[PDB]
Amino acid sequence: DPNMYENIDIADFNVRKGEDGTIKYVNFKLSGDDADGLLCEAQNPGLPSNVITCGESKYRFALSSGKQYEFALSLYHELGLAVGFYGTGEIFTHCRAGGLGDFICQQQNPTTIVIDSLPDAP
Ligand SMILES: [Ca+2]
Ligand SMILES: [Cl-]
């Protein structure tokens, strides 16, 4: 963690929720050591979602419920190694009306999530 890691910048994180609370769509732009404003997106991802690949890249993500904020992101980067980079962070969102009952919950400030080759802290 302190020495071998990758800073992932998340921007424009956006989630559309139905009146249901079901996730209709999730969208964000990822920047890292090998990405600049890479689109990560999913329609009907589930909560928690499966691991989803960003475009054609070696970056992937999963969406889950946070503990401080509503949404948490898990991020993955395949390195061509037997181990990969992984990390999780919560993203503050402000929710607005999305039309016909929907919510659109939107990140207000870019945030950084650190990923590395260690698993989750206990
Ligand atoms: Ca990690
Ligand atoms: Cl971790």
PDB file of C-alpha atoms and ligand atoms in Angstrom, residues 1 75 84-88 114-121, ligand 1:
ATOM      1  CA  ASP A   1       0.000   0.000   0.000  1.00  0.00           C
ATOM      2  CA  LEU A  75     -11.991  -0.543  -8.906  1.00  0.00           C
ATOM      3  CA  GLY A  84      -4.084  -7.355  -9.895  1.00  0.00           C
ATOM      4  CA  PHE A  85      -4.728  -3.940  -8.375  1.00  0.00           C
ATOM      5  CA  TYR A  86      -7.925  -3.412  -6.377  1.00  0.00           C
ATOM      6  CA  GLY A  87      -9.399  -0.776  -4.092  1.00  0.00           C
ATOM      7  CA  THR A  88     -12.654   0.750  -2.910  1.00  0.00           C
ATOM      8  CA  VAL A 114      -6.105   4.336  -4.162  1.00  0.00           C
ATOM      9  CA  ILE A 115      -5.819   0.817  -5.532  1.00  0.00           C
ATOM     10  CA  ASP A 116      -3.081  -1.704  -4.816  1.00  0.00           C
ATOM     11  CA  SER A 117      -2.391  -5.428  -4.677  1.00  0.00           C
ATOM     12  CA  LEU A 118      -3.677  -5.875  -1.147  1.00  0.00           C
ATOM     13  CA  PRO A 119      -7.155  -7.221  -0.343  1.00  0.00           C
ATOM     14  CA  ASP A 120      -9.714  -5.382   1.808  1.00  0.00           C
ATOM     15  CA  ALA A 121      -8.725  -4.193   5.277  1.00  0.00           C
TER      16      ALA A 121
HETATM   17 CA    CA B   1      -6.207  -3.138  -2.456  1.00  0.00          CA
END
